[PDB]
């Protein structure tokens, strides 16, 4: 039966421009449908499942069963908590349920540590789907969620545009968006938006990321490995080439997802907002992988801070924040995987954000120490801004060198 799925046809999600002809034809009824305030429940479910299955039917086509396990597993625990949270409500019951919901994803991440192989529970979207699932567990806990169909829940948790690696969503907003179809002019406004996003994505992914990714990066790596040592000028090379590739590949993908999402009526959250022109490490995370960043803000960061203030575990205002940054970004690192360089990239932005936070407050203390001394406030102009942007950009790019795990091949061929 595993053999049947490896026999089954396979389509790379936004893998070629040819993919859109299918998905276009496929989405076409749904979109026309929205103009008459109609959704085709069964058809949407069909088209969703086919393109999801096609995305998961590679050489490791077995992963589709891993998905179905995952769905049953999620329904079991999502509803377990729904049923519980109706009557009573406890800290530790919530904790347990959260852990159980994330557990498949934890096993997937931990499996190469213990073994050297992927988990059997591993399928493609697992990393991004888990957020959607825990989302509800957290939201029921807060009492901001009470009602939902298994329909509503599955619709949200296994949404097809944002499945593979797409923009992360929250239930309440998604369901609200799906609940009322947008009116005629607003709707084909989304068509304009979609055709824009598809075209930009074509350039971003197939052209620009092609140049950085498959054209310039592989020889530069070969050069950097040839020259050896802790660093070299070709390693500074791979730092920027990858950095742009990582950006274009993902940002283009995101736009694709957003566009396809728009063609299914709903407007999914945005992942990038010109992240490189950011002056600040704080501003970078308001501009880079935003859906992931914004999620981690409101679910991992804000929630850990609330704990460190309910308990008042740390002495002053600033240290609670700094522990929160470090832990919060470190979790995100683990989210990418349990490899040294992910946890490293984790702690990098951790210490990064603490540095950044302390400097902002040190800038006010130097402005208080001058304005009350007789001098004019320390200069802020065009070249100061530019310097910030320059410093931020290189810190960011360096983190991407860490994140690539190219350093793993450069330092430890061994």
């Amino acid at each position: 039966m595993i053999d049947f799925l490896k026999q089954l046809p396979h389509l790379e999600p936004y893998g070629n421009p040819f993919y859109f002809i299918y998905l276009g034809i496929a989405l076409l009824p749904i979109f026309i449908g929205l103009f008459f305030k109609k959704r085709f429940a069964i058809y949407e479910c069909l088209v969703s499942i086919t393109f999801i299955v096609l995305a998961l039917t590679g050489t490791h086509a077995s992963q589709i069963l891993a998905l179905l396990f995952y769905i049953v597993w999620q329904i079991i625990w999502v509803y377990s908590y729904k049923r519980y949270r109706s009557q009573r409500d406890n800290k530790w019951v919530f904790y347990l349920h959260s852990f159980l919901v994330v557990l498949p994803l934890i096993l997937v991440k931990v499996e190469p540590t213990i073994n050297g192989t992927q988990s059997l529970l591993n399928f493609l979207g697992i990393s991004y789907l888990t957020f959607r699932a825990v989302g509800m567990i957290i939201e029921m806990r807060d009492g901001v969620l009470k009602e939902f169909t298994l329909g509503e829940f599955l619709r949200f948790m296994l949404f097809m545009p944002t499945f593979t690696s797409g923009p992360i969503d929250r239930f309440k907003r998604f369901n609200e968006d799906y609940q009322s179809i947008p009116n005629r002019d607003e709707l084909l406004n989304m068509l304009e938006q979609a055709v824009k996003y598809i075209m930009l994505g074509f350039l971003y992914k197939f052209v620009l990321a092609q140049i950085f990714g498959s054209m310039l990066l592989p020889p530069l790596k070969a050069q950097a490995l040839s020259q050896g040592g802790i660093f070299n000028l070709p390693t500074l090379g791979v730092m920027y080439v990858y950095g742009f590739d990582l950006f274009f590949d993902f940002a283009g993908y995101s736009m694709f997802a957003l566009a396809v999402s728009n063609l299914m009526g709903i407007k999914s959250p945005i992942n990038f907002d010109k992240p490189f022109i950011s002056r600040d490490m704080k501003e970078f995370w308001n501009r880079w992988h935003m859906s992931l960043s914004f999620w981690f803000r409101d679910f991992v960061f804000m929630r850990l801070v609330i704990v460190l203030m309910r308990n008042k575990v740390f002495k002053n205002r600033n240290t609670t924040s700094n522990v929160a940054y470090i832990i919060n970004m470190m979790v995100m690192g683990f989210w990418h995987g349990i490899t040294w360089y992910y946890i490293a990239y984790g702690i990098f932005h951790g210490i990064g954000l603490v540095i950044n936070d302390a400097w902002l407050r040190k800038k006010k203390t130097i402005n208080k120490d001058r304005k009350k001394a007789g001098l004019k406030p320390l200069p802020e102009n065009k070249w100061t801004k530019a310097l910030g942007i320059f410093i931020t950009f290189n810190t960011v790019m360096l983190s991407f060198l860490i994140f690539s795990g190219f350093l793993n091949d450069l330092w430890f061929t061994k």
Binding site: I138, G143, V144, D298, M302, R303, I306, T320
Partner: protein, 79 residues
């Protein structure tokens, strides 16, 4: 005490600024509450009012003025 007059006390208890009669002030715009100040107020609102108020759903538009915190305290006190 009333659910408007008691919030008036605590606001200047660990920040030191009065917004009684002019209360529709955006306190993020006023410079009273910072990025880490909200949590400090919400924890003393958690303690003194005995009310647990959620943070995953908290947005910038929601609880920004001293009126939209007073009117949000009465809503999460009974229903």
């Amino acid at each position: 005490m009333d659910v408007k007059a008691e919030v008036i006390e605590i606001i200047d208890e660990l920040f030191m600024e009065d917004v009684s009669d002019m209360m529709d002030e955006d306190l993020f715009d006023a410079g009273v509450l910072d990025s880490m100040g909200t949590v400090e107020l919400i924890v003393e609102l958690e303690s003194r009012f005995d009310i647990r108020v959620p943070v995953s759903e908290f947005g910038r538009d929601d609880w920004n003025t001293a009126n939209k915190i007073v009117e949000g305290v009465t809503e999460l006190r009974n229903a």
